[PDB]
Amino acid sequence: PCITILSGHFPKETIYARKTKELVEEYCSIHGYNFYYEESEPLETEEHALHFRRSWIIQQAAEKFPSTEWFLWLDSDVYVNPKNKNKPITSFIDLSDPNILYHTFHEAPWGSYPINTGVKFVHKDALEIEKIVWSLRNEAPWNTFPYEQKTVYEYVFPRIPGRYIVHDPYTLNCIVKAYPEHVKDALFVHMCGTSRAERDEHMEMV
Ligand SMILES: [Mn+2]
């Protein structure tokens, strides 16, 4: 399928995010995926609004790449494992069921929520849903942690029974501290919960 990977970060001075951007862009070039990257400074800078911004950036990606079938959001703290950069996304996940609108990933047993949306596949037919997710950013309880992640799991999922899958995260949302043993074989490696300087240091070793 036509896949558009999207992400974003501000400011440009944040080195780890420059590096993850580079690796994602390279990965897209290898497999012919579209790549959308939001470099603008957010107008709403509170923690909740920052987390929700992915559901606004997806519309940017849809406008730029109208032929997209699958949108793939990656946090700026996610990168493509160099060992696996020559392998397409479809070698790791089956996107053939026409009924699915979201592919998401758990973070068990080490995490704190049933899904981790640092990596999130959204079908083109869920763009109007993402518009709703964005609209909920300033309404309780969706404006409370974990924000868009809670909104997807607790607002969206109940309303689309059978049209989402929660997958093991070992290859596609491979949280570094939680699944160190799987990092080597992952496609998407997720530097979740760590500081900027810690991320800079990790990326230097990549
Ligand atoms: Mn993250």
List of residues 6+ apart from 101 with CB closer than 8 A: 122, 123, 125, 126, 129, 160, 163, 164
Paired with 103 in beta bridges are: 121, 165
Closest to 116 measured CA to CA, from 62, 193, 43: 193
Backbone dihedral angles phi then psi of residue 133, each to the nearest 5 degrees: -55, -50
Give 4's strand partners. Answer: 34, 71
H helix or E strand, kind and range, residue 50: helix 47-52
Given resolution (angstroms): 1.6
Q: Does 192 appear as a known binding residue?
A: yes
8 annotated binding-site participant: yes
Q: How far is CA 165 from CA 89, 161, 190, 194, in A?
A: 16, 10, 19, 27
Q: What total of structural domains would you count in the chain?
A: 1
Task: Give the tokens for residue 30.
Answer: 């290898």
Provide the phi-psi class of 116: left if phi over 0, else alpha when psi is between -120 and 50, else beta.
beta
Tokens of 163: 């049209």
CA angle 73, 108, 138 (to 5 degrees): 50
- By the CB criterion, residues less than 5 angstroms from ion ligand 1 are 75, 77, 118, 192
CA of 119 relative to ligand 1 center, distance in Å: 8
Query: Which tokens is 153 given?
Result: 């799991």
Q: Could you list the residue range(s) of the whole structural domain that residue 195 is in? A: 1-206
Q: Please state whether the peptide bond connecting residue 114 to the residue before it is cis, i.e. omega within 30 degrees of 0.
A: no
Give the CATH number, domain containing residue 13: 3.90.550.10
- CA 63 to ligand 1 centroid distance, Å: 25
75 is in an annotated binding site: yes
SS3 115: coil
Cα 94 to ligand 1 centroid, rounded to whole Å: 23
Helix (H, G, I), strand (E, B) or coil at 70: strand
Q: Which pair of structure tokens corresponds to residue 22?
A: 């580079």
Q: 144-163 burial string, b = 16+ CB within 10 Å, else e?
A: eebbbbbbbbebbbeeeeeb
